[PDB]
Amino acid sequence: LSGKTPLFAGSTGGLLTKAVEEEKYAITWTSPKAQVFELPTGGAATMHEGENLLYIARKEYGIALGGQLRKFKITNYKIYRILPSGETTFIHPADGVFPEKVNAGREKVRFNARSIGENPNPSQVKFSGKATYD
């Protein structure tokens, strides 16, 4: 991960020991202009001209931030998952296309060909380990 941290003096709302112990996420993006943007947790910061990087405690802070950057007309936002052993993964746009738009490589996951109304009654499914929504 390569990028400049946005300039802000610091804030109590931010990374805690859970970042070092369990996992921390990091959001990266590129800007045309240096502007002011509200951080995900308190305060304001001055994003640099290009290749900005920010470490966030949760994934929700990044996508929430990504929506704000879209209002500044920035859609090249990328999120990573950093584990304590240094492992990094391309999490949010696993495929390069955004989730809203379609791609052929994707496949159905947890699809029910029936309707919710046609779910089995739970009395038919008890003492078996099965749930109705399967």
């Binding site: 805690l16 020991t17 859970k18 369990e22 405690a57 949760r58 994934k59 929700e60 996508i63 929430a64 999490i91 949010h92 989730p99 809203e100 738009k101 379609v102 791609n103 052929a104 994707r106 496949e107 159905k108 996951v109 947890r110 699809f111 029910n112 060909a113 029936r114 309707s115 919710i116 109304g117 749930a131 929504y133």
Partner: protein, 80 residues
């Protein structure tokens, strides 16, 4: 963790993917003739259960349903 189940009555609004904060959802194509768009729940580990997807679903009743279950650090939204 939680389980997001998506049923046959999807029509391809894509609104569920937008309202989601955690990117648990993704729009995939259908081999069928219905449309080139179906909602999916590929990464359910990040599902927190905020039911924003169920607020953006314009069906007679929910095509996409969120069933709560076992909890984790991620599903509880704990930054500590």
């Amino acid at each position: 963790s939680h389980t997001v189940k998506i049923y046959d009555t999807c029509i391809g609004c894509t609104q569920c993917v937008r309202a989601c904060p955690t990117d648990v959802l993704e729009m995939v194509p259908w081999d069928g003739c219905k449309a080139a768009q179906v909602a999916s729940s590929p990464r359910t580990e990040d599902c927190v259960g905020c039911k924003r997807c169920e607020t953006a679903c314009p069906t007679d009743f929910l095509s996409i349903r969120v069933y709560l279950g076992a909890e984790t650090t991620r599903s509880m939204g704990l930054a500590y």
